[PDB]
Amino acid sequence: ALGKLQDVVNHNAQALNTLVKQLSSKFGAISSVLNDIFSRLDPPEAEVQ
Amino acid sequence: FVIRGDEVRQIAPGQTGNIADYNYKLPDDFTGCVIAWNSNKLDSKVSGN
Amino acid sequence: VYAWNRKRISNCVADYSVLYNLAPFFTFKCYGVSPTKLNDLCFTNVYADS
């Protein structure tokens, strides 16, 4: 019957998992890797990327 | 200065090439205008310049 | 000159550096592309004549 105590832990773990998974989102950019954009692309619009 | 017609592209931020690397390099943050015009009537020798 | 020769240089890695030792300085004039940055850029096929 200890669902109330388990729910809090589940919710916190799932929120952390979603937050740490959000790093792979492209957001419409060329790539999700910073160094790849800086080195393999010129500053003038890499800055806005 | 004086350069060739084809390689005038390298006088601009972020490009690479012979002059861009070894002769004249613009900085990443630039605030200015570039002017280029043909000078075939003045700098051209038949024998060679 | 009237009967020139053609060879297809494909499926290999180029070594354009060796070409500079030829000639006292050179007669290397190069049209349409930067002569000194041919190494990093990549191309489809390279025809050669003589």
Swiss-Prot record, chain B:
Domain of life of the organism encoding this protein: Viruses
Known outcome of mutating residue 6 to N: In strain: Omicron/BA.2, Omicron/BA.2.12.1, Omicron/BA.2.75, Omicron/BA.4, Omicron/BA.5, Omicron/BQ.1.1, Omicron/XBB.1.5, Omicron/EG.5.1; complete loss of interaction with host integrins
Residues covered by region (Integrin-binding motif): 4-6
Subunit structure: Binds to host ACE2. RBD also interacts with the N-linked glycan on 'Asn-90' of ACE2. Cleavage of S generates a polybasic C-terminal sequence on S1 that binds to host Neuropilin-1 (NRP1) and Neuropilin-2 (NRP2) receptors. Interacts with host integrin alpha-5/beta-1 (ITGA5:ITGB1) and with ACE2 in complex with integrin alpha-5/beta-1 (ITGA5:ITGB1). May interact via cytoplasmic c-terminus with M protein. May interact (via N-terminus) with host bilirubin and biliverdin, thereby preventing antibody binding to the SARS-CoV-2 spike NTD via an allosteric mechanism.
Role of this protein: Attaches the virion to the cell membrane by interacting with host receptor, initiating the infection. The major receptor is host ACE2. When S2/S2' has been cleaved, binding to the receptor triggers direct fusion at the cell membrane. When S2/S2' has not been cleaved, binding to the receptor results in internalization of the virus by endocytosis using host TFRC and GRM2 and leading to fusion of the virion membrane with the host endosomal membrane. Alternatively, may use NRP1/NRP2 and integrin as entry receptors.
Protein name in the entry: Spike protein S1
Organism in which the protein naturally occurs: Severe acute respiratory syndrome coronavirus 2 (2019-nCoV)
Residues of the full protein shown: 400 to 448 of 1273
Swiss-Prot record, chain C:
Domain of life from the UniProt record: Viruses
Substitution effect: residue 27 to A: In strain: Omicron/BA.2, Omicron/BA.2.12.1, Omicron/BA.4, Omicron/BA.5, Omicron/BQ.1.1, Omicron/XBB.1.5, Omicron/EG.5.1
Subunit and interaction comment: Binds to host ACE2. RBD also interacts with the N-linked glycan on 'Asn-90' of ACE2. Cleavage of S generates a polybasic C-terminal sequence on S1 that binds to host Neuropilin-1 (NRP1) and Neuropilin-2 (NRP2) receptors. Interacts with host integrin alpha-5/beta-1 (ITGA5:ITGB1) and with ACE2 in complex with integrin alpha-5/beta-1 (ITGA5:ITGB1). May interact via cytoplasmic c-terminus with M protein. May interact (via N-terminus) with host bilirubin and biliverdin, thereby preventing antibody binding to the SARS-CoV-2 spike NTD via an allosteric mechanism.
Function: Attaches the virion to the cell membrane by interacting with host receptor, initiating the infection. The major receptor is host ACE2. When S2/S2' has been cleaved, binding to the receptor triggers direct fusion at the cell membrane. When S2/S2' has not been cleaved, binding to the receptor results in internalization of the virus by endocytosis using host TFRC and GRM2 and leading to fusion of the virion membrane with the host endosomal membrane. Alternatively, may use NRP1/NRP2 and integrin as entry receptors.
Protein name in UniProt: Spike protein S1
Gene this chain is encoded by: S
Residue span relative to the full protein: 350 to 399 of 1273
